[PDB]
Amino acid sequence: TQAVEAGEKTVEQFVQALNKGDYNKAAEMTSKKAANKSALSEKEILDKYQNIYGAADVKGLQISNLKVDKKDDSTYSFSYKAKMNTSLGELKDLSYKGTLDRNDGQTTINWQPNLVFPEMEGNDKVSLTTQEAARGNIIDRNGEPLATTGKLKQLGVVPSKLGDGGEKTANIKAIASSFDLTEDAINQAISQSWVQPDYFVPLKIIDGATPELPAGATIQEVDGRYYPLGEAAAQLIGYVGDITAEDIDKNPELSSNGKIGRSGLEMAFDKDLRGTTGGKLSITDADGVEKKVLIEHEVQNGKDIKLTIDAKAQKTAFDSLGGKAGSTVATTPKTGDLLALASSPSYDPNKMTNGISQEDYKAYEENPEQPFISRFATGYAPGSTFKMITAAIGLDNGTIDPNEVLTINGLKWQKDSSWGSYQVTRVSSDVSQVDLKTALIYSDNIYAAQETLKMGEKKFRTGLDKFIFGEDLDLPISMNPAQISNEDSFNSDILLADTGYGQGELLINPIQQAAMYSVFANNGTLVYPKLIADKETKDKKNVIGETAVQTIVPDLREVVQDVNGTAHSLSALGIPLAAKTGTAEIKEKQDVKGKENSFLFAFNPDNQGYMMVSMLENKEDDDSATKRASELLQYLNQNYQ
Numbered sequence: 001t002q003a004v005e006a007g008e009k010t011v012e013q014f015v016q017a018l019n020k021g022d023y024n025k026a027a028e029m030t031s032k033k034a035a036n037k038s039a040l041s042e043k044e045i046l047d048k049y050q051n052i053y054g055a056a057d058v059k060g061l062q063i064s065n066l067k068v069d070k071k072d073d074s075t076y077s078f079s080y081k082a083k084m085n086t087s088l089g090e091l092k093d094l095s096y097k098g099t100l101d102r103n104d105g106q107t108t109i110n111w112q113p114n115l116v117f118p119e120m121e122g123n124d125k126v127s128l129t130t131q132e133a134a135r136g137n138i139i140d141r142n143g144e145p146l147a148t149t150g151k152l153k154q155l156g157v158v159p160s161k162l163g164d165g166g167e168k169t170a171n172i173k174a175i176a177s178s179f180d181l182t183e184d185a186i187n188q189a190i191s192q193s194w195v196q197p198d199y200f201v202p203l204k205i206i207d208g209a210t211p212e213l214p215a216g217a218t219i220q221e222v223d224g225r226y227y228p229l230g231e232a233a234a235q236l237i238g239y240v241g242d243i244t245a246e247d248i249d250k251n252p253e254l255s256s257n258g259k260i261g262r263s264g265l266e267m268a269f270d271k272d273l274r275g276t277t278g279g280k281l282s283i284t285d286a287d288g289v290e291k292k293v294l295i296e297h298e299v300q301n302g303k304d305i306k307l308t309i310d311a312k313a314q315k316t317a318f319d320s321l322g323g324k325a326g327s328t329v330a331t332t333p334k335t336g337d338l339l340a341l342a343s344s345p346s347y348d349p350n351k352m353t354n355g356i357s358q359e360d361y362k363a364y365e366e367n368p369e370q371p372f373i374s375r376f377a378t379g380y381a382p383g384s385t386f387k388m389i390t391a392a393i394g395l396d397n398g399t400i401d402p403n404e405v406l407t408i409n410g411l412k413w414q415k416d417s418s419w420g421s422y423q424v425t426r427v428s429s430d431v432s433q434v435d436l437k438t439a440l441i442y443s444d445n446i447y448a449a450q451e452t453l454k455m456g457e458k459k460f461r462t463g464l465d466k467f468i469f470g471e472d473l474d475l476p477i478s479m480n481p482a483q484i485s486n487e488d489s490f491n492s493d494i495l496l497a498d499t500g501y502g503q504g505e506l507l508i509n510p511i512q513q514a515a516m517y518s519v520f521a522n523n524g525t526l527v528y529p530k531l532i533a534d535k536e537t538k539d540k541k542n543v544i545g546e547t548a549v550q551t552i553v554p555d556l557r558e559v560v561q562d563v564n565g566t567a568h569s570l571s572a573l574g575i576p577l578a579a580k581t582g583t584a585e586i587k588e589k590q591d592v593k594g595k596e597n598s599f600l601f602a603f604n605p606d607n608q609g610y611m612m613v614s615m616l617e618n619k620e621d622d623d624s625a626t627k628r629a630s631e632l633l634q635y636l637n638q639n640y641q
């Protein structure tokens with residue numbers, strides 16, 4: 001019993017070395033090679049575990065129900081149950097048996113082939129057959145493909161079928177101008193270290209009709225992931241890349257020959273899309289004939305994922321951004337169906353997944369406008385659009401009377417001289433008697449600032465805490481919860497007023513904005529947005545009063561219909577619109593000289609069919625989200641009542 005304690009420790013140390021992948025330490029715990037002792041030397045045990053466990057990608061060896069007895073002055077037997085993870089799943093309920101050896105002072109293990117796998121005897125071999133699973137598709141709300149696997153034609157050249165130095169240099173220029181490729185880059189491709197004369201060096205993937213093939217140009221059909229919308233949904237969908245050896249070490253169920261989602265929904269739904277590897281893990285005898293099947297199951301393809309996205313709305317929303325920095329979110333506000341999640345500028349997902357040069361990839365990362373950012377999931381200051389919420393809160397707690405006129409003379413105002421040089425600014429001084437309808441049409445920041453200070457921080461945060469601030473939305477998109485300020489108290493009348501017109505320490509991403517503003521399409525009920533089609537419509541009752549909704553929405557119509565409304569350019573559509581524009585100022589967020597973001601909110605006040613929140617980040621002069629909304633508003637109005 002004094003030595004049985006060391007035997008149970010030796011078996012525990014041996015399993016840990018196998019689990020940790022250090023087969024040399026596990027082999028050094030075995031006795032000398034002899035009959036009725038260890039069956040192989042330390043190096044022979046190392047090369048057998050490295051072969052068998054390495055082939056099946058064994059990871060996470062865990063044991064239980066250990067028992068170590070005695071049988072002689074040196075023969076102590078042990079037994080335990082174990083489970084392990086392989087390329088074909090978990091191998092559980094394994095019965096292991098063996099004997100330890102207590103000689104001299106230390107206790108070792110009489111190694112046997114049955115300690116690799118239970119029923120292995122002598123010179124038995126192990127074989128592994130696998131069949132890769134087909135990756136599932138990502139489809140929109142009407143079944144249109146957003147991410148699928150198809151047969152893409154690949155362009156490539158064979159250096160031997162080119163020329164001889166003089167005739168070769170002519171076809172390189174001929175094959176470069178007929179496919180829009182840099183002639184200096186084609187020579188770069190056939191100059192890689194892996195290239196041989198009679199090899200097919202791939203160049204690009206033709207996404208259309210195949211032109212004329214010069215001397216040495218060949219087209220080979222290959223299978224790969226394809227994104228029909230390309231840039232228009234690259235941030236949302238993402239891309240898949242080659243699976244590396246480090247990916248297999250973290251999850252051996254992955255197919256070494258397959259693709260893995262690197263970003264977007266391809267990565268978020270990688271498990272459901274990649275399926276399960278089929279095949280058989282069996283123990284053969286010395287000749288190679290099967291004698292024991294450890295694991296076997298049929299290949300299961302990946303499940304399709306159906307989104308609430310409208311492909312025609314996703315493409316239109318992205319194209320309307322004209323390559324500028326910004327994003328657009330379109331929802332059906334009564335249910336929360338995310339119709340479009342566009343972010344601009346964007347990258348080419350087909351280029352990323354079908355091989356891309358380190359220059360084009362560095363161009364994406366060195367781009368100042370940062371196309372890799374999912375801007376619909378990035379928090380921004382809401383802008384003057386937030387005045388809708390501030391007004392609704394003031395109407396609910398009785399601070400704001402819709403017909404009461406505040407006297408606002410000039411273009412600047414401050415509470416007292418304690419504000420120093422800071423003054424809430426105004427765009428027009430033509431209306432000195434300002435009511436709620438006037439303040440929403442002209443976007444009067446002074447009105448919102450005075451009513452917020454009159455409301456007070458306590459009453460303002462009471463209505464704000466009824467929204468989704470600090471909540472993690474149940475969406476497969478990585479985002480941080482919205483915030484009112486950095487701390488739980490403004491501790492500043494200036495910050496309280498700035499938050500009043502949506503320009504304080506507020507941080508709300510476009511998706512969360514569409515969630516908050518949905519109260520104006522559901523009589524004060526907040527409807528959470530959903531991206532997966534089969535999910536249930538979750539809402540939140542009594543966020544703002546229905547009395548406030550029936551007061552603000554008529555004024556939001558006037559933001560479009562009134563001749564001095566900030567969204568009057570949208571009245572050309574001739575459709576029922578309720579809108580609220582916004583322009584936020586960001587001063588040296590990193591460091592600059594003054595950048596401003598443009599915002600637009602709009603929805604149908606008659607049928608509540610659609611809702612839209614578009615924005616431009618670091619906008620150019622005379623550019624805005626309202627300028628670019630006619631096309632998307634037209635489509636959403638006709639197709640979503």
Ligand SMILES: *C(=O)[C@@H](NC(=O)Cc1ccccc1)[C@@H]1N[C@@H](C(=O)O)C(C)(C)S1
Pocket residue numbers: 383384385425427442443444445501566580581582583584585596
């Ligand atoms: C809300 O966002 C308000 N914006 C400002 O006070 C900042 C600003 C930025 C550029 C020029 C002037 C003022 C108001 N809303 C916007 C808008 O709705 O477009 C206005 C420009 C009307 S000021």
